[PDB]
Amino acid sequence: LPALKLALEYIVPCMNKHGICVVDDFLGKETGQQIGDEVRALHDTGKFTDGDKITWIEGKEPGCETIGLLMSSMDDLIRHCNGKLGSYKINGRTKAMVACYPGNGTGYVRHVDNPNGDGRCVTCIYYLNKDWDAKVSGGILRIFPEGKAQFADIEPKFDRLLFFWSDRRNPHEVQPAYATRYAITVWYFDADERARAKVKYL
Amino acid sequence: QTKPLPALKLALEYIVPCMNKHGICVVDDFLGKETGQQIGDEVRALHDTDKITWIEGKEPGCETIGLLMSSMDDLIRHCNGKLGSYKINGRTKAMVACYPGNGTGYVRHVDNPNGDGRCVTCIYYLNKDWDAKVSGGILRIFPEGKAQFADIEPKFDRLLFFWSDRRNPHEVQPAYATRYAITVWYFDADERARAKVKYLTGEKGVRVELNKPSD
Amino acid sequence: LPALKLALEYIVPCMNKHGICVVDDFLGKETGQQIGDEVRALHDTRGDKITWIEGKEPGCETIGLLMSSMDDLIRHCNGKLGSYKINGRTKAMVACYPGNGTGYVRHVDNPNGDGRCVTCIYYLNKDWDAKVSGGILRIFPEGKAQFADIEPKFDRLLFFWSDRRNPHEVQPAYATRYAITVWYFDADERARAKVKYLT
Amino acid sequence: LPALKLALEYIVPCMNKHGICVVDDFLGKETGQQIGDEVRALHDTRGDKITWIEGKEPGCETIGLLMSSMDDLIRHCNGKLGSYKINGRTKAMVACYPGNGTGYVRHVDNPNGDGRCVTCIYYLNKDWDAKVSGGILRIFPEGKAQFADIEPKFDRLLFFWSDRRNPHEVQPAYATRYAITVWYFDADERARAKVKYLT
Amino acid sequence: QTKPLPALKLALEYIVPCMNKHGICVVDDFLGKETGQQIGDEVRALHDTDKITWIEGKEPGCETIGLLMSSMDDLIRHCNGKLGSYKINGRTKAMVACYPGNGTGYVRHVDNPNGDGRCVTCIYYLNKDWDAKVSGGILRIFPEGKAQFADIEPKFDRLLFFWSDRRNPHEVQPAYATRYAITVWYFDADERARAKVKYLTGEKGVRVELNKPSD
Amino acid sequence: LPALKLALEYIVPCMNKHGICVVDDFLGKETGQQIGDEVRALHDTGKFTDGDKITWIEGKEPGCETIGLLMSSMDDLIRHCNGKLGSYKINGRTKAMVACYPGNGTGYVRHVDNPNGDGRCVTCIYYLNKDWDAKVSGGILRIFPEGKAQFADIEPKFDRLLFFWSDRRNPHEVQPAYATRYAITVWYFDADERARAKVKYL
Ligand SMILES: O=C(O)c1ccc(-n2[nH]cc(-n3ccnn3)c2=O)nc1
Ligand SMILES: O=C(O)c1ccc(-n2[nH]cc(-n3ccnn3)c2=O)nc1
Ligand SMILES: O=C(O)c1ccc(-n2[nH]cc(-n3ccnn3)c2=O)nc1
Ligand SMILES: O=C(O)c1ccc(-n2[nH]cc(-n3ccnn3)c2=O)nc1
Ligand SMILES: O=C(O)c1ccc(-n2[nH]cc(-n3ccnn3)c2=O)nc1
Ligand SMILES: O=C(O)c1ccc(-n2[nH]cc(-n3ccnn3)c2=O)nc1
Ligand SMILES: [Mn+2]
Ligand SMILES: [Mn+2]
Ligand SMILES: [Mn+2]
Ligand SMILES: [Mn+2]
Ligand SMILES: [Mn+2]
Ligand SMILES: [Mn+2]
């Protein structure tokens, strides 16, 4: 299951078909647990902006190589879909939103990542909660594809990667959880949208 | 053999009042393990011989399915005109459906919103030993104008009745294992007619010719 | 404009980009008046009245004309209209609405896939000021961040998808209203519909 | 923790920032058990059962105790609790829920301003695994982009606004459930309520 | 004088069946111009002597308002137990309300969702010569489980009846001129009782003392 | 009715009360019609980005002095509310979104200007449609204040200025219109929100 294959053979169609792509075992046990620890590190040192504990990583951070690995690893796959994903000309990506979600019975109401057209067109999420039994611990992502007669409960299973369109096509809510959960989110811009979105400023 | 079905008593003394009061009626241990597992096989067979398929009941390798349908009919028969104001004159084929276990769920919806004639939805679950607590697949019903709602388990050998119009909206929680169910809709004499008139059944129509004579 | 041009250069793209298409001055005040007269006369032989017309019936010639000219447009869009293979049609729903002060709740024509894929409406209300008598059709094209109010303008023709893509509500009217409606079936879908019924 | 500290240092701010406040280990497994026994015994003299308790009745002493200790918390929050002037209370709604597989539809306690401003619930279900038996209370704090699932944990006390600010639904239970509920009235509001009724 | 009111015929032959069938009933030219304009003055007077006020009917300068109420009662009286299954044993005071003309509207809502005893909302419009086409203020009702909805004009000397439970949700379009209306709710014997029991009326209560004896 | 008065005496309270402030006759007939023409100018020359004809003005544009007047005129009022409007520390503002709305029966579904927290906290709109009879031509703004039992239909009357919070508190839809209408929209940032919103990028 090589790199460009996953991209042009599974992602692109599965995405242009439904608008949701799941990828199990993206980096492997050892490589994943690595990030798994590397993220728990940041949970202590500080600089964690924003309960709702999140923080933004650029990849070249002090000692956060593996997070950078993951990021730069996703970049490949998205690059390998150039012009294939809808009419979207994808170029840049936000910094990695490494987030530690509370898990105290807290859930997040349904919403849309990019309803205004702020540029973000492909949400990309990585789950790193080792042995996160969603059957008991809960904390599942639920997506309601606009105009479809079905919906999907995606579990934050360990070492799972998830893609979906960020616009009004994918409204989604997150069932609450009872244990602490970690996850890394990333968005990708459409060259035109991200640009048009910038004429507002000075 | 099959479990004895006192269709008359079960209709008049239980199903009818239940339906009238609540609009939802469950009947467990409908055909017994013996017939149930059998239908299990019969349906898992058609898998070979989200996908569905329609059955009249006479098809080969579908004997017990036709049996199930005949039982459903047996129950609706002894209801008479007591089951709501509806006069049930007929029904659809049996929708034998294979639902996948990929964590897929079904949005809130209503079987018959347009008024196409269907008045009573009827479902039968044949999943041998299905723990809804483990695999999910629960069916959530919201009885219109009530302060409660109900999570019905797709328990093995369970039969489910409910009105199909705006009165019973429902969701289907995702399942994490393949699941099987047979659905049937009963028609109200009048509504089905006006439906056929209004072209809400897709049965009628008018041919559109390839061309017309100029002028 | 010829039917082919109107079809291929206007209707097909308008229907693909939006799923809603208006066509003003379809048959001209000349023929439109006759269609109107036929209908008004037809509905003299206070809720909403509807009588289905084949087109061949007496005193319903011009109605049939309208239907024919509709079918031609549909012929020119054959294959190019969405992803549908249209082979069927419904009788002309000649409908006389009350105009008392009651609108029709927001809904969708074909929610369960009964075969119908294109709703096609023709208005006959001469000098109908929507800002005075109302009866406006509000459509909410699913997905699009805008919505539209279509006025029952005389001699107006209106196409739109029948599925969940175009839910819509009718604003109340304060005067007698007339509108002929037809639906078109997708060859496959309508056939897939019949399957559930007994032989 | 003393009632005053718990009141002024925890409940008042928690109620102001959110309008929802949980308090675990309110009376301890010691007294909680007795409250439970009183209730369970009380409900032996399959839909949901409810019997209102004043607290003074026989075999309902400990219930009354719970009520008292609730009132004290309310006394310590006097004036500081939202913008309400609490002067009244309802009898203890001792409720036994079925646990058959039926939840209670999403709703709001006080939608028309009947006087009630604070819903206050105390759970008595020993060793109640919400992940096995369910019966969870899901609240949607209006305005906030999050929502919460409150587990009917034994000896748990739960405060929340009764108005449109906190709509909420109860997940179905798969075992017999017990929960005592009380509401508090805002002096003005409840008085403004009576006005509409005849002398 | 006032217009003759055949309360008996109007109740039995029109209002009752109308209500039962649709759940909404309008009665125009209820009291005639004479009494109508009078109530006009009577209410515009209380403005002096979004604001509201409650009236029993006996208040000075409210004679014709009490009259209006007595008429409403007259009509509901001759309904008997025919008006739904409800047994109307009483009602609220008359809510005389002054609605402002600042382009303010009222969200979709339901008078009695909790089940507080109110079963029938009753409204009377006294706006001398109000063109709803010009100033708006229309009341839109959505009869639960129906394919139509209705825009009721707050026409002068108009009386309006409808169920107050989940069956009749409604919106009020904004008005661009001051508007006046008198509302009244009738109680169902049973529901009001269970309501008083459930403390849904705010009437009952329990005193909370300033302090308690320590220990 | 001087400048700082309108600000601290009417805006701030009316805003902290409801979250919607209307101001009739902001610049006056002659001064308003001026913008009224100055905007119709741009409708021809070009450079109108984005039917839905809109364009972004910085105020110092060629010959667009009066638009700049309006912008710089609003700036005063918002400056005169420093720290008074909620807990919002307002600093910057987007470029003026001068928009020519179609008016062919087109309406805009209800929405929220800033549901994600992109910085914008105060929507400010100026209407310049001379004698725009909304009774006939229509095209009215309808706002549904979150948690309130009433809603408001604000007419785009000529020379009217409108303020409202942009976040989830003010969902709003626009009734369709039948004639061409022009309007100038502006947003204001909360120093903290606009800042936090920027950690995403690189
Ligand atoms: O900044 C934004 O627009 C923004 C950020 C995050 C976000 N999402 N989406 C799904 C999240 N999630 C939470 C737990 N599991 N998943 C989550 O946090 N959506 C939008
Ligand atoms: O064609 C129709 O009208 C139609 C089809 C399906 C359908 N439903 N609803 C809930 C179903 N389900 C799935 C699993 N367990 N239950 C199911 O099959 N209802 C109506
Ligand atoms: O059978 C159905 O579901 C069904 C039938 C008709 C219908 N339509 N369509 C357009 C209508 N209209 C336009 C102006 N006044 N009325 C109208 O009533 N929508 C749905
Ligand atoms: O009268 C009313 O509207 C009314 C009454 C009770 C009520 N609540 N509140 C908390 C309940 N609950 C908690 C766990 N199981 N049930 C519950 O049923 N909500 C509203
Ligand atoms: O207290 C209550 O339950 C209560 C109050 C008001 C109310 N409504 N509803 C529509 C009203 N209206 C306003 C103008 N024309 N009609 C009006 O007054 N309904 C119920
Ligand atoms: O870019 C954005 O997020 C954005 C831009 C504009 C916008 N709004 N709001 C009200 C508009 N309008 C239209 C007619 N009358 N008013 C309008 O255009 N909302 C959000
Ligand atoms: Mn998200
Ligand atoms: Mn269904
Ligand atoms: Mn329609
Ligand atoms: Mn409740
Ligand atoms: Mn009301
Ligand atoms: Mn906006």
**Helical pair C61-76 and C28-42, crossing angle rounded to 10 deg:** 130
- List the structure tokens of E153: 């004009």
Q: What angle do CA D147, D148, D149 make, to 5 degrees?
A: 140
The residues that bridge with F184 in the sheet, in sequence order, are F98, F126
Closest CB to A115 among F58, F115, F202: F115
Chains touching C (at least 3 CB pairs under 8 A) are A, B, E, F
Sorted by sequence, the CB contacts under 8 Å of residue B131 that are 6+ apart come out as none
- How far, in Å, CA of B124 to CA of B184, rounded? 9
- List the structure tokens of E46: 């209380």
Q: What radius of gyration do chain F's Cα atoms show?
A: 16
**Helical pair D61-76 and D28-42, crossing angle rounded to 10 deg:** 130
Give the residue among E46, A14, A147 at the shortest CA–CA distance from C19.
A147
In the block, tokens 């239908």 appear at B39
CA atoms within 13 A of residue C54's CA, in its CB half-sphere:
6
- List the structure tokens of B88: 């049930």
Distance from Cα E212 to the centre of ligand 1, integer Å = 49
Q: How many CB atoms lie within 10 A of CB F199?
A: 15
- Three-class SS state of F183: strand
β-strands B94-99, B51-55: how paired? antiparallel
Residues in chain E: 215
Cβ-Cβ contacts under 8 Å, B152 against chain D: 101
- How far, in Å, CA of A131 to CA of F48, rounded? 54
Contact D68, D25 (CB under 8 A): no
- How far, in Å, CA of E46 to CA of B89, rounded? 63
In the block, tokens 């690995």 appear at A69
Instruction: Give the ligand whose atoms come closest to the C-alpha of residue F126.
Output: 6
- List the structure tokens of C20: 């809603």
- How far, in Å, CA of A185 to CA of B157, rounded? 44
Q: Is the dihedral of CA D74, D78, D81, D82 positive or negative?
A: positive
Do the Cβ atoms of D86 and E208 come within 8 Å? yes
* Ligand 4 atom nearest to E199, measured from its CA: 1
Q: How many CB atoms lie within 10 A of CB B23?
A: 20
- List the structure tokens of E132: 């709803």
Phi-psi category of E146—alpha, beta or left, where left has phi over 0 and alpha has psi -120 to 50?
beta
Contact A117, A177 (CB under 8 A): no
Give the residue among B157, B161, B155 at the shortest CA–CA distance from B143.
B161
Q: Which residues of D touch F (CB under 8 A)?
A: 142-143, 145, 164-165
Residue nearest to atom 3 of ligand 3 (CA): C109
Q: Is the dihedral of CA D29, D30, D33, D35 positive or negative?
A: negative
Q: What is the DSSP letter of F164?
A: E
Distance from Cα D145 to the centre of ligand 10, integer Å = 20
- How far, in Å, CA of E119 to CA of E192, rounded? 9
- How far, in Å, CA of D127 to CA of D187, rounded? 38
**Helical pair A65-79 and A29-45, crossing angle rounded to 10 deg:** 120
Contact E158, E214 (CB under 8 A): no
- How far, in Å, CA of B33 to CA of B40, rounded? 10
- List the structure tokens of E152: 């009721």
| Burial profile B76-86: b = 16 or more Cβ within 10 angstroms, e = fewer | bebbeeebbeb
Residue nearest to atom 11 of ligand 1 (CA): A174
- How far, in Å, CA of C74 to CA of C119, rounded? 12
CB F175 near ligand 6, within 6 Å: no
Task: Find the closest chain C residue to F137 by CA distance.
Answer: C131
Q: What is the DSSP letter of A138?
A: B
Q: How many CB atoms lie within 10 A of CB F13?
A: 12
Q: Which residues of F touch A (CB under 8 A)?
A: 49-50, 56, 58, 92, 94-95, 97, 111-116, 118, 187, 196, 199-202
Q: Is F113 annotated as a binding residue?
A: yes
**Helical pair E32-46 and E63-77, crossing angle rounded to 10 deg:** 120
Contact C181, C187 (CB under 8 A): no
- List the structure tokens of C72: 């031609």
Closest CB to E166 among B145, B166, B167: B145
Give the residue among F42, F36, F40 at the shortest CA–CA distance from F131.
F36
- How far, in Å, CA of C172 to CA of A30, rounded? 66
Q: How many CB atoms lie within 10 A of CB B70?
A: 11
- How far, in Å, CA of F121 to CA of F47, rounded? 28
In the block, tokens 């205004």 appear at A116
- How far, in Å, CA of A89 to CA of A189, rounded? 8
Task: Find the closest chain E residue to C102 by CA distance.
Answer: E150
- List the structure tokens of C82: 């969405």
Do the Cβ atoms of C145 and F109 come within 8 Å? yes
E-state strands within chain D: 20-23, 49-53, 86-89, 92-97, 102-107, 116-123, 137-139, 146-150, 156-161, 168-170, 177-186
Closest CA–CA distance from residue F132 to any residue of chain D (Å): 35
Contact D157, D121 (CB under 8 A): yes
Q: Is F172 annotated as a binding residue?
A: yes
Candidate from A122, A185, A188 with most ligand 1 atoms within 8 A of CB, to mutate: A185
- Three-class SS state of A5: helix
Q: What angle do CA B175, B176, B180 make, to 5 degrees?
A: 55
Contact A29, A22 (CB under 8 A): no
Give the residue among E104, E95, E94, E96 at the shortest CA–CA distance from E137.
E104
Distance from Cα B159 to the centre of ligand 2, integer Å = 14
Distance from Cα E211 to the centre of ligand 7, integer Å = 49
Q: Cα dist. C86→C114, C116, C187, F196 in Å? A: 14, 9, 6, 54
- How far, in Å, CA of B161 to CA of B88, rounded? 14
The residue type at E159:
L
Phi, psi of C6 (to 5 degrees): -55, -40
Task: Find the closest chain C residue to F101 by CA distance.
Answer: C146
**Secondary-structure breakdown of chain D: helix, strand, coil percentages, each rounded to the nearest 5:** 30, 30, 40
Chains touching F (at least 3 CB pairs under 8 A) are A, C, D, E
Runs of H (alpha helix) within chain F: 3-5, 12-17, 29-45, 65-79, 191-196
Task: Find the closest chain A residue to C163 by CA distance.
Answer: A147
- List the structure tokens of B70: 């005949």
Distance from Cα B166 to the centre of ligand 9, integer Å = 18
Using CB atoms within 10 Å of the CB of residue E178, give its burial: 0 to 12 exposed, 13 to 18 middle, 19+ buried: middle
Phi, psi of E40 (to 5 degrees): -45, -60
Do the Cβ atoms of B149 and D101 come within 8 Å? no
In the block, tokens 């509920």 appear at D181
* Ligand 5 atom nearest to E112, measured from its CA: 3
Using CB atoms within 10 Å of the CB of residue C60, give its burial: 0 to 12 exposed, 13 to 18 middle, 19+ buried: buried
Task: Find the closest chain F residue to D167 by CA distance.
Answer: F147
Three-state SS string across B114-150, please?
Answer: CCCCEEEEEEEECCCCCCHHHHECCEEECCCCCCEEE
Chains touching D (at least 3 CB pairs under 8 A) are A, B, E, F
Contact C33, C99 (CB under 8 A): no
- Three-class SS state of B9: helix
The overall longest dimension of chain C from CA atoms, in Å, is 51
- List the structure tokens of F68: 């700049």
Do the Cβ atoms of F106 and C148 come within 8 Å? yes
In the block, tokens 């702020």 appear at A118
Give the residue among D94, D91, D89, D90 at the shortest CA–CA distance from D48.
D94
Contact A73, A104 (CB under 8 A): no
CB E139 near ligand 5, within 6 Å: yes
Q: What is the DSSP letter of D8?
A: I
- How far, in Å, CA of B205 to CA of C184, rounded? 9
Got the DSSP string for C98-157? --SSEEEEEE-S-SS--SEEEEEEEE--TT--HHHHB--EEE--TTSSEEEEE---TTEE
β-strands E104-109, A90-93: how paired? unpaired
Instruction: Give the ligand whose atoms come closest to the C-alpha of residue F110.
Output: 12
Give the residue among E140, E136, E179 at the shortest CA–CA distance from E160.
E140
> How far out from the chain centre does Cα C135 lie?
15
Owning domain of residue B66:
1-215
- How far, in Å, CA of B120 to CA of B84, rounded? 10
Cβ-Cβ contacts under 8 Å, B54 against chain C: 195-196
Give the residue among E171, E164, E207 at the shortest CA–CA distance from E186.
E164
The residues that bridge with F54 in the sheet, in sequence order, are F99
Give the residue among A184, A191, A192 at the shortest CA–CA distance from A73.
A184
CB C179 near ligand 3, within 6 Å: yes
CB D120 near ligand 4, within 6 Å: no
- How far, in Å, CA of F70 to CA of F128, rounded? 11
- The domain that holds B171 is classified in CATH as 2.60.120.620
Q: Which residues of D touch A (CB under 8 A)?
A: 131, 140, 145-151
Method: X-ray
Count: domains in chain C: 1
Chain breaks in chain B (C to N over 2.5 A) after: 49
Closest CB to F56 among A94, A114, A200: A200
Give the residue among D103, D30, C89, E189 at the shortest CA–CA distance from B205.
C89
Sorted by sequence, the CB contacts under 8 Å of residue A36 that are 6+ apart come out as A128, A129, A130, A158, A182
Sorted by sequence, the CB contacts under 8 Å of residue E38 that are 6+ apart come out as E64
The residues that bridge with E118 in the sheet, in sequence order, are E187
Q: Is the dihedral of CA B37, B38, B44, B50 positive or negative?
A: negative
| Burial profile F124-162: b = 16 or more Cβ within 10 angstroms, e = fewer | bbbbbbeebebeebbbbbbbbbeeeeebbbbbbbbbbbb
Closest CB to C105 among E147, E151, E152: E147
Q: How many CB atoms lie within 10 A of CB A27?
A: 18
Got the DSSP string for F78-109? HHTTTTTSTT--EEEEPPEEEEEE--SSEEEE
Phi-psi category of D28—alpha, beta or left, where left has phi over 0 and alpha has psi -120 to 50?
left
The residue type at B45:
A
The residues that bridge with D51 in the sheet, in sequence order, are D94
Closest CA–CA distance from residue F126 to any residue of chain E (Å): 18
- How far, in Å, CA of B92 to CA of B164, rounded? 13
Instruction: Give the ligand whose atoms come closest to the C-alpha of residue B162.
Output: 8
Candidate from E93, E104, E142, E183 with most ligand 5 atoms within 8 A of CB, to mutate: E183
Give the residue among F116, F127, F133, F121 at the shortest CA–CA distance from F178.
F133
**Helical pair B32-46 and B63-77, crossing angle rounded to 10 deg:** 120
Using CB atoms within 10 Å of the CB of residue A188, give its burial: 0 to 12 exposed, 13 to 18 middle, 19+ buried: buried
- How far, in Å, CA of A68 to CA of A120, rounded? 20
Give the residue among E119, E118, E115, E135 at the shortest CA–CA distance from E127.
E135
Q: Is C40 annotated as a binding residue?
A: no
Give the residue among E185, E196, E146 at the shortest CA–CA distance from E162.
E185
Q: Give the count of Cβ contacts less than 8 A between chain E and F.
A: 27
Phi, psi of F41 (to 5 degrees): -50, -55
